[PDB]
Amino acid sequence: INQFRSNFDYNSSPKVQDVNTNFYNEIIMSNVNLVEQFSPLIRMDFELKSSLRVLSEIKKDRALSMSFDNNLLTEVKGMEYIIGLGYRFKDVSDINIKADFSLRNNETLVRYLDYDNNQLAAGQNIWSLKLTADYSFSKNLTAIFYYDHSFSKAVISTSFPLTNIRSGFTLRYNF
Amino acid sequence: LTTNEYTFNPQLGYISLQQRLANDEILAVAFEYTVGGKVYQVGEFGSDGVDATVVTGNNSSNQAIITQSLVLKMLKSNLTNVKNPVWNLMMKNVYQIPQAYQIKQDDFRLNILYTDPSPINYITPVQGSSFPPNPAPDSKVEQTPLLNVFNLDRLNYNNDPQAGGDGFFDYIPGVTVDVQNGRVIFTTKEPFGELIFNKLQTGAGESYNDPTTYNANQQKYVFRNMYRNTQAGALQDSDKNKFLLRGKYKSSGSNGIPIGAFNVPQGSVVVTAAGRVLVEGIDYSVDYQLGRVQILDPSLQASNTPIEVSLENNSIFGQQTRRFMGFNIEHKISDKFVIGGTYLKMTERPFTQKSTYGQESVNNTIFGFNGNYSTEVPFLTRLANKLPNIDTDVPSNLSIRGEVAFLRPDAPKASDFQGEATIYVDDFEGSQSTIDMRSAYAWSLASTPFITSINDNTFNANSNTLEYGFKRAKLSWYTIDPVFYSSKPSGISNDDLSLNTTRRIYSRELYPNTDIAQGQIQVVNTLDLTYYPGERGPYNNNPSFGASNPSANFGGIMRALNSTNFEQGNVEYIQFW
Amino acid sequence: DIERPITTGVPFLLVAADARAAGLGDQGVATSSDVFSQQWNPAKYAFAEDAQGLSISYTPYLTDISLGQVTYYNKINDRSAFAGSFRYFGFGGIELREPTREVNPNEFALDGSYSLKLSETFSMAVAARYIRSNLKVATEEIDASAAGSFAVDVAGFYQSEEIAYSDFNGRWRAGFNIQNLGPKISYDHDDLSANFLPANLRVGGGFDFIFDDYNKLGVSLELTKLLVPTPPGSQADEANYKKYKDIGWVSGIFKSFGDAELKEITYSAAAEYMYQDAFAMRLGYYHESPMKGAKQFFSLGAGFKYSMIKVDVSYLFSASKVKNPLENTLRFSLTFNFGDKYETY
Amino acid sequence: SNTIDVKPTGSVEMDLGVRYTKQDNPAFSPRNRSSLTFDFDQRISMSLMGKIGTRLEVNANYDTQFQNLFKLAYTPSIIQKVEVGNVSMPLNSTLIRGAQSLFGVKTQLQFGRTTITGVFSEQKSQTKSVVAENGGTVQNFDLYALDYDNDRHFFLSQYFRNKYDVSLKNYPFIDSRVQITRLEVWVTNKQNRVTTTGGGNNLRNIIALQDLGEAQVSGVPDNEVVVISSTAGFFNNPIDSPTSNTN
Amino acid sequence: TLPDVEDINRDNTMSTINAYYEYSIDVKPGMQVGENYITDIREVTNVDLPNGGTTNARWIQFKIPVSQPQNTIGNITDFRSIRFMRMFMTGFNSQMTVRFGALDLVRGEWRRYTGTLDDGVEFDVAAVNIQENGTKCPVNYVMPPGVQREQLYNNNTVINQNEQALAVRIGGAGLQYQDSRAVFKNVSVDMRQYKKLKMFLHAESLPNQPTLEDDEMVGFIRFGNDFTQNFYQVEIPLKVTKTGGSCSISPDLVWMDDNSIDLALDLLTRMKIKAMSIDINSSKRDVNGIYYPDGKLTLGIKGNPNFGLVRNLMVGVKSRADHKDIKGEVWFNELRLADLENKGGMAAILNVDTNMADFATVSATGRKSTIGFGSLEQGANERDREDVQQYNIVTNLNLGKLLPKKWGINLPFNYAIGEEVITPEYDPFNQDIKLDQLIRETTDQAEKDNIRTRAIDYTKRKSINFIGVRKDRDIENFTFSQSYNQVERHDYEVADYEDEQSNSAVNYAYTFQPYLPSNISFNTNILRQSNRQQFREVEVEGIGLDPLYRRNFAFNYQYGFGFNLTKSLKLNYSATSNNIVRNFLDNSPKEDFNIWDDYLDIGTPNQHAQQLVLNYDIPINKIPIFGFVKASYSYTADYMWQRSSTAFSEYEDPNGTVYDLGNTIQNSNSNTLTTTLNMNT
């Protein structure tokens, strides 16, 4: 409860009813917030046989925020899928590979009580696929091929689904 | 507004918004206060008001939604009418100390002055005025300083009342100052406007509501037009805006004097405490990473002298290339006696030859002398140890330094106009700043217009029936996208991209004198307005539309301007080509 | 104050991209064979006394804009070489005011050049560039995807073996370079409006004194002619520009000389002084006409050579005219050399 | 003489890649589909040290992220030193206090006892100052009558407005009894959004009236307190009662 | 991808109100540059269509003045709330495509002046522009003769910057015999180094109007503090550029050198001096008290304006046609300032540092400057305008050195004198005139001595102090102090000023060492501050204003009683108090008082602040059954007492009765227990 109050109207008078019709609750308030959150709903650290490091979280949460001004609640969602991934090719020399898939979804439903008008008000479906593979040519010179794919999605009708892809090699020379 | 987006003095009743809603927003309030044992309320709260929605049905095809409005009080409407009292509800006695923090007392000196030609801090009559005689002990505008004239200095240092006042601004953290962020608040609805009027008044024939019946003395000081008129207005009432209020506020200085520069180039700072330069290690120390010069001189530490500091920062982004020609002869006469040269020429290089006012270029040349004769005075060390318990044989020195350093300024000959040092106080180059409006998508259909007054129905603009858009032709606004010109879609002959209503106007036609950059958009987009006054337009059930003379129909397109108040925007012209 | 300049299409090509040049007056046309010589005189790759090298340079434009060149030469025989350069003028960093679209404006100019050694003294090289500009990356009635074009280069480089003069036994160097020769660019993607390419006719020479046989001091001069027709300086005032714009490039390169004298040839002089060949102290003065380009400076520079990497740096003291966007910078360029040291006669 | 030992340190990075990007808003042309810009990045972060030829002295630090330093000293066994790039020119005078960070050439010349240190170079600094009193950095301000604070401070009603300048006759004691217990403020919602973390998502219609409350005060006329064109039969309280809904 | 709401500006409401301002462009086949709102036509002749053809296009430039509506639909009054620009196209008979090359709300920077200096006079303020208005009908905008085009680099390419002017355009009924019209901006320009203020001008008849003659138009450049009570009106009778029809008149005939103000600023000061002795009431003050002195300017002054405060520039157009309606199109252009004061400066720093073998460190200084000396980077309006005579003397002794090293003391005894004498180049009243031209301008030595005595800024500052006195080793381990700063000053504003600081602190800080107190701390410090101000009356240097006495006489002290009563109790205690002294008053202060009056006084309390902090680490481990719980406890309690200044302590009701609204009290508690309960059973 972000801020409750004492109602001056719940005093002593022979006037126990408000405008619409009620009994003048003693504790006025507004915006009761229930926040639920599976931070790692499941996390699966997965250090495999040779080297196949894996770390796939699943975050999640809800943010019910019922306000007593207009009497309509607002639910928010989590769904932050993550898949880490690591491997090492050997002596081709060594080639370190990392891959970080991720998928974030959202919602901001505004739900009316007195009739079914639960309507969407925000959202995202951004998933990204960073993927690097680096290889050293000597003590000084290294290369790394990186590939960063990313795709947004229209949850609301004013988001303009992006898709953007960075690629190409990056060398590196350490003196 | 969340409780962190405003404040309010909960004893005098003024909101203190944190975002300056000034583009014709609407700002209502509902509040609830208590005069002692009673409870009042001049709004309607969410937890008190009529409910948001009320349905009266069971299916989507028989529900009757009813939304409800929550009557409130208005503090400024959209259309800022100056006559209406919602205008007066705005509070015009708050002056925000520019770039201020929690301005603690004793580091804040406010001082009102009257710069008629120059800053003088007492009001004088005008040619026989002779301010109204026998003033009360409170008003007394005869010789009193302006802080007393403005009822802003009547308390001692300890905020208990004193006869004439401590001479200093009072700084009551609720009444006269919003300590958290600047905001000197004068203790009157309108100090410069009506306080001075009632304090210079000389009878009852004078009234504040009519500027024609003024004293001829309160006709030079009563600045009524900043309280009865906007701030962009009252520029035309210019002969009265001479009541500046200078002041000084200090920063924290907790760690040390925060210079204001980061990563100072070493050996640059010069902290001349009271006129005499201080030694870089014996009485002050600099961080060189944070600013924060720190005077470790205990006597000079707690003295309140204005320790000034020259910095030599190197974080200039966007300055003029400077050149630092120079040298310094350094002759060594018999040991511990030298002589100096130090010729120097620092020359700015202006960006353009049209050196504007303030951004001026310098061509200065300094040349000086030196001195610095040193000596030991063993006579004086003997004098020292020819005293009581003193014993030390540590040496004694009598260094003596001197300099002259003539300076001769100039202005770089690049920024000359016919052989002079022009500065161009105003080359009329910044005037006429434009705001674009040919964005083909930000427009939209328009309500049917009126023509002569709010009483003519040339376009059926008052018809409340469906006979409202009968006179709407088929206006279509757009811009020919670049696909037609670059890569002809199948169907448009090249004789279609050439008939002077679809041509891809290059900027070399409109602006043949402008030099478009390379690689940038050489093509002047348009806002084509193809109007079909016979094509029935969008929505209208016009039954005939065949006898209607097409010179009677319109086609409309309305926008929404990003910035209202053309007064303080100074919008003057609607240009177009 | 310059009257009637010449709008030379893509302008990033003209500006130097390295430090061996542009710390030397922007000439490099009669300067010793080096890994940078692809923008200046690709012919002199044949005379490189290494097998193969590659380099990365950088000019910051502290106005974060930048101009960076990456080159790689590899001489196959002792008598020929290939090379490939890549200039990238970029507006490093961008955002479109909730993932937002990222649009980097940039004007890369890929390039590749063959360089044969005709006789024992001077070599000839032929180069080709795919210029491509994408500056106008934007939205809603200003379409991106601007195109480039192709350009050809013809360079000749006359090295001289040795003469052993009175007391300093120097050698001679000469060279010409016909720069960008390609069909005119159209930024707006039309055929009724197109800018000329920056064709150059840079011709230079130089002589280096040799002291101790590995302590040399070489001076040189360059003359740059911008081979685009000069614009004509109001029905006639329109028809004149129309006759200017309806000129083909193959005919403008010929015309090139109906100014309105014609001594609007930018000249640059410079001096090398490399000590033992692993250190060099470059001086150079560059001058364009103050009416026909308004650009001149007094470039300083230096260069070091540790084992096979050379670090070249240089500064650009702006002589007189209007603010040059690179006046307080350091054109930092860096090289790498590989085996097969060739014996240069 | 020999021993060119300029040993560079640091790193270099090139980022030769492709960068594809496409939105799908319909408002664009069919031409702005799928931008495909090349991408190139450099991260030279080197630094050179070394003492060439037993006399020269190189030092340099070039980073691709303003203060890139490059000093090139020299010290003979009539010529004392010749720097280039990060000359200093200290020149301790207290009148002729020359710059200390500046790019260019600096020389020196000992003609027996007449050193003639001279600098030609480009100053790269600004020489700003402060006036710190006890504490730190006294910084002045200068307002005027007319440039008060814009429409950001509002009285809460004509009652408080007309009562302000009278309740402050004797500043610290405020001649009133008011105490604003609760206060809600409602602004136009120009930015159509919905939140939960901002405090809540409570937003309603509003019909904010102008004369809501405002029992007529004693001094000023009625035409300046209430906007209703005809106040006849409008007030149902005495002529000074505080602002309430029932005035 | 947005719905088609009936809400344009996204305010979430509709706002079905009608308050318009119509502006009706015509669309005819004619439209020369005069009638509707045209300003340019810029006819092109041969444009290369993509089919090889060629058209004749025009680009008629409309420029509608927002401040002159043709009608007003609804209760609209002024342009303080504008929104929803709605254009619509009526009157046509068929297909009609209009292409807006640049539709634009152009906002000026110059704010047409309203008011007498409302009969129908269409006064307009555009900016003629070389990139757009290089093809105007009456006269093509040609750059004034000397003016270049201001080259600039965008990206590796020159880019000719723009050039503009003003377009003060009179229409309608035209100006009357002296009714002028002006345009003003605001500025803080200080034109005191530069010796001439000069700008171009340009006059033009109006297209399709009676041509102007070579008079009845004037430069009219009111500047200075004001527009009707403090100004420096420069004026110039313009002469029209005779137009014949060429429409492309050369630059030297557009920007004639007869229509070009020169106005050496050193003449304005002699005009100001000649008019100081001409009162505000006379026949010399012509009509509006402008005092025209009756080259080619007819300068005017109305009440001592200033330089350095040249706010409120006003360029305009005033008629002097004996009987005619003027209708002109004046252009104003480059308003620069001519050459500056290349004179120089001079400094004479002289320092003297001495030592007396670790005992005394007498330094001394002194620097004399002259008018114009700054530093290299100092601009033109910030180098120096004050002869200055700094000197300083610091005399750090070490008195403890005079006594034996046994029972040694530390008596530093800093003593500093020094002051500033400053005479400004310009007198601090009539800021633009110099002191010399006014001292040498009157034989009224009673007033000549008022001048050059109300301008010699003067300071002086003494600083004695013994900071750090103590006896190095209920023992003798105090730490005393003493400080005393005087400041006196009589600059232009304050006839005499006085500050005295007399901090006199003392500290104890025992810090015990083995139930007794682990620590003890104590300290007091008398803090006396005394200030006087007498703001001088600048008219006559006689008595001046009443003095204003500020006094901050305070006593205040601390404590601290750190007890470690057991191993499981760490209770501190730090009271503090701050009381004031009021020897120097009822509300009428005593202008007979002194800083070194009754000095060890301990006046009435002002603030009192307790504080207690007890920590208790819960000896439950002693009990050998619960020895698994690291239970702690902390209790910080506070308390404070305010004084509630006498405006409360003797508030008197309007009934006459005097109440006592008391002085406030505050608590605070911080109970804090953080147990562990490590399950070890």
Give, in degrees to the nearest 5, the angle at Cα E255 between E252 and E261: 125
Q: Quote the CA–CA distance of D208 and B70 in Å, as a whole number.
A: 8
Distances (CA, A) of E344 to B344, B406, E416: 14, 7, 32
Nearest C-alpha of chain B: how many angstroms from A29? 7
List all chains that touch chain D, counting a touch as 3 or more CB pairs closer than 8 Å: A, B, C, E
Q: Using the beta-carbon criterion (under 8 Å), do D190 and E645 form an inter-chain contact?
A: no
Judge whether E179 and E115 are in contact, CB under 8 Å: no
- Token pair of C67, please? 């101009």
User: How far, in Å, CA of B65 to CA of B52, rounded?
Assistant: 10
Take residue B468 and report the two structure tokens written for it: 């409202």
- C45 contacts C113 by C-beta, under 8 angstroms: yes
Q: For residue A163, which residues of chain C lie inside 8 Å, CB to CB? A: none
User: Chains touching chain B at 3 or more Cβ pairs under 8 angstroms?
Assistant: A, C, D, E
Place of tokens 């190409």: A168
Check CB contact of B479 with chain C, cutoff 8 Å.
yes
Measured CA to CA, the distance from residue E478 to residue E410 in angstroms comes to 12
Tokens of E371: 């008018």
Residue with the two structure tokens 């009558």 = D145
Task: With CB atoms and an 8 Å threshold, state whether C304 touches D48.
Answer: yes
Q: What one-character DSSP code corresponds to residue C229?
A: P
C17 in contact with E at a CB cutoff of 8 Å? Answer: no
Task: Show the tokens assigned to D88.
Answer: 């200093």
Q: Which residues contact D79 (CB under 8 A, 6 or more apart)?
A: D107, D108, D109
Locate all alpha helices (DSSP H) within B426-520, ordered by sequence.
482-486, 507-510
- Give the three-state DSSP class for E347: strand
DSSP D177-200: ---EEEEEEEE---S----STTS-
The DSSP bridge pattern shows strands B571-576 and E61-65 to be: antiparallel
The CA-based diameter of chain D, rounded to the nearest angstrom, is 108
Report the distance separating Cα C87 and Cα C85, nearest Å: 7
Nearest by CB to D94, from E10, E349, E651: name it: E349
Cα E378 to Cα B362: distance, rounded to the nearest angstrom? 8
Q: Which residues pair with A119 in a beta bridge?
A: A110
> If you count residue pairs, one on B and one on E, with CB atoms under 8 Å apart, how many are there?
593
Q: Which of residues 256-315 of B touch D (CB under 8 A)?
A: 256-261, 263, 265-268, 270, 272, 277, 293, 302-315
Cβ distance B482 to C7 less than 8 Å, yes or no, reads no
C318–B349 CB contact, under 8 Å: yes
Residue listed under structure tokens 């007392």? B105
Residue B159 in tokens: 């905020």
CA dist C240 and C253 (Å) reads 18
The single residue listed with the structure tokens 């006469």 is B333
Q: Answer positive or negative: Cα dihedral of C338, C342, C345, D2.
A: positive
Q: Is C114 helix (H, G, I), strand (E, B) or coil?
A: strand
Where are the strands (E) in chain C, listed by range? Answer: 52-58, 65-74, 80-91, 109-116, 122-132, 148-159, 171-181, 201-210, 215-224, 266-271, 274-275, 279-287, 296-297, 300-305, 310-315, 332-337
Q: Which of D45, D196, D205 would best serve as a mutation to test chain A binding (most A beta carbons within 10 A)?
A: D196
Tell me the chain A residues in contact with residue B39 when contact means C-beta distances shorter than 8 Å. Answer: 8
Sign of CA dihedral D229, D231, D235, D241: positive
Helices (H), E384-461: 435-439, 445-448
Residue carrying the six token digits 């330089």: E307
How far is B40 from E113, CA to CA, in rounded Å? 47
Q: Counting beta carbons within 10 angstroms of the beta carbon of residue E267, is it exposed (0 to 12), middle (13 to 18) or buried (19 or more)? A: middle
**Distances in Å between the alpha carbon of E34 and those of A156, E206, E207?**
52, 8, 6
The coordinates were experimentally obtained by cryo-EM
Q: Is residue B530 within 8 Å of residue B478, measured between CB atoms?
A: yes
Q: Which residues of A touch B34 (CB under 8 A)?
A: 8
DSSP annotation string for D79-98: ----EESS-------SSS--
d(CA B357, CA B425): 5
Q: Check CB contact under 8 Å for C68 and D40.
A: yes
Question: B547 — contact with chain A (CB < 8 Å)?
Answer: no
* CA D78-D79-D84 angle, 5° bins: 160
Does A70 reach chain E within 8 Å, measured CB to CB? no
Phi, psi at B295, each rounded to 5°: -85, 105
- Does the CB of C99 have a partner CB in chain A at under 8 Å? yes
Min Cα separation E309/chain D (Å):
13
- With a CB cutoff of 8 Å and minimum separation 6, the contacts of B261 are B291, B311, B313, B315, D128
E149 at C interface, C-beta within 8 A: yes
Q: Is residue E164 within 8 Å of B431, Cβ to Cβ? A: yes
> Contact B494/E111 with Cβ under 8 angstroms?
no
Closest Cα to residue E343, out of E419, E428, E272, E434? E434
How far apart CA C191 and CA C205 sit, in angstroms, is 40
CA–CA dist B53, B173 (Å, integer): 44
Q: Which two tokens stand for residue E406?
A: 């046994």
R_g of chain C, CA atoms, integer Å: 21
For residue D239, the one-letter residue type is: I
CB contact under 8 Å between C330 and D68, yes or no, is yes
Q: How far is B61 from chain E (nearest CA, A)?
A: 23
Residue pair E258/E239 in contact (Cβ under 8 Å)? The answer is yes
Q: Is E645 on the interface with D (CB under 8 A)?
A: yes
Nearest Cα residue to D227 out of D210, D240, D245: D210
Output phi, psi for D183, to 5 deg.
-150, 120
Q: How far is residue B361's CA from residue E340's CA, in Å, rounded to a whole number?
A: 12
Q: What is the C-alpha separation between E294 and E283, in angstroms, rounded? A: 11
CA closest to B565 among chain E residues: E80
Q: Is the dihedral of CA B547, B553, B555, B558 positive or negative?
A: negative
Main-chain phi, psi angles of E131, to 5 degrees: -75, -35
What is the number of residues in chain C? 345
Residue A144 CA to residue D17 CA, distance in Å, equals: 11
- 3-state SS assignment for residue E254: helix
Instruction: From chain C, pick out residues whose CB is under 8 angstroms from the CB of E45.
Output: 235, 238-239
Distance in angstroms (rounded) separating the CA atoms of residues E256 and C103:
51
Beta bridge partners of D61: D47, D69
The residue of chain B with its CA nearest to that of C316 is B321
**What token pair was written down for C310?**
């050379």
Q: How many CB atoms lie within 10 A of CB E93?
A: 10
Q: What is the dihedral of CA B215, B218, B224, B225, to 10 degrees?
A: 100
Assign E586 to helix, strand or coil.
coil
Give CA–CA dist C326/C342, Å, rounded.
Answer: 36
Using CB atoms, pick whichever of D6, D36, D39 lies closest to residue C304.
D6
Contact (CB, 8 A) for C150 and C132: no
Return the closest-CA partner of residue B158 out of A115, E25, C330, E552: E552
CB contacts of C187 in chain B (<8 Å) are 518-520, 522
What's the DSSP call for residue D232? T
Give the nearest chain A residue to D43 (CA atoms): A172
C48 neighbors C75 (Cβ within 8 angstroms)? yes
Q: How far apart are CA C319 and CA C322, in angstroms?
A: 9
Neighbouring residues of B558: CB distance < 8 A, sequence distance ≥ 6: B443, B444, B445, B446, B447, E8, E84, E85, E86, E87
CB C273 within 8 A of CB C281: yes
Determine the distance in angstroms separating the CA of B531 from the nearest CA of chain D, rounded to an integer.
22
Q: B-contacting residues of D 80-119, CB under 8 Å? A: 88-91, 93-102, 104, 113-119
Whether A172 sits inside 8 A of D11 (CB atoms) is: yes
Q: Which residues are CB-neighbours of B334 under 8 A, at least 6 positions away?
A: none
Least Cα distance to E261 among E278, E241, E284, E237 occurs for: E237
Nearest CA to D144 out of E312, C87, A174 is that of E312
B53: nearest CB among A8, A29, A112: A112
- Is residue C101 within 8 angstroms of chain A, CB to CB? yes
A125 min Cα distance to partner chain B (Å) = 27
CB-based burial, A67-102: b 16+ in 10 Å, e otherwise? bbbbbbbbbbbbbbbbbbbbbeeeeeeebebbbbbb
Tokens of C58: 């950088």
Inspect the interface and report whether the beta carbons of B52 and A70 lie closer than 8 Å: yes
| Number of other residues whose CB lies within 10 A of the CB of residue B159 | 23
C330/D62 Cβ within 8 A: yes
- Output phi, psi for B301, to 5 deg: -60, -60
CA distance E86 to B557: 6
Calpha distance B447→E663 (Å, rounded):
65
Distance CA E319, CA C239 (A): 44
Chain A CB within 8 Å of residue E679 CB: no
Residue B198: φ, ψ to 5°: -65, -15
* Cα A97 from Cα A102, distance rounded (Å): 17
Are the Cβ atoms of D173 and E11 closer than 8 angstroms? no
Against chain E, the chains showing at least 3 CB pairs within 8 Å are A, B, C, D
Q: Do E661 and D173 touch (CB under 8 A)?
A: yes
- What is the distance between the alpha carbons of residues C38 and C36, in angstroms, rounded to a whole number? 6
- d(CA A54, CA A45) in angstroms, rounded, equals 6
Instruction: Please calculate the CA angle A80-A86-A90 and round it to the nearest 5 degrees.
Output: 170
Task: Confirm or reject contact between B518 and chain C (CB < 8 A).
Answer: yes
The reply to whether E1 touches chain A by the CB within 8 Å rule is yes
Closest approach of D81 to chain C, Cα-based (Å): 17
Say if CB B447 and CB B469 are below 8 A apart. Answer: no
Cβ contact E2–A160 (<8 Å): no
Report chain C residues whose CB lies below 8 A from the CB of E135. Answer: 234
What whole-number distance in Å separates Cα of residue D223 and Cα of residue D207? 22
H helices then E strands: how many in chain A? 0, 11
SS percent in chain C: helix, strand, coil, step 5: 5, 40, 55
Residue type, B104: K
d(CA C190, CA B523): 10
Enter the resolution in angstroms.
Answer: 3.5
Tokens read off for A56: 């796939």
Dihedral sign from CA coordinates of E105, E110, E111, E115:
negative
Least Cα distance to A163 among D23, C98, C37, B77 occurs for D23
Other C-beta atoms closer than 10 Å to the C-beta of E492 total 18
Q: Give the whole-angstrom CA distance, residue E435 versus residue B524.
A: 60
Print burial letters for C136-168: b (CB count within 10 Å at least 16), e (below 16).
bbebbbebbbbebbebebebbbbbeeeeeeeee
Interface residue ranges in chain A relative to chain C, Cβ cutoff 8 Å:
124, 126, 150, 152, 162, 164
Broken C–N links (> 2.5 Å) in chain D, after residues: 65, 77
| Terminal-to-terminal C-alpha distance of chain D | 100
User: Which run of H or of E encompasses B378?
Assistant: helix B378-385
Question: Which residues, other chains included, contact B254 with Cβ-Cβ below 8 Å and sequence gap of 6+?
Answer: none
Q: Mapping DSSP to helix (H, G, I), strand (E, B) and coil, where does residue B56 land?
A: coil
Task: Determine contact: D12 vs chain A, CB below 8 A.
Answer: yes
User: How many Cα atoms sit within 13 Å of E76 on the Cβ side?
Assistant: 21
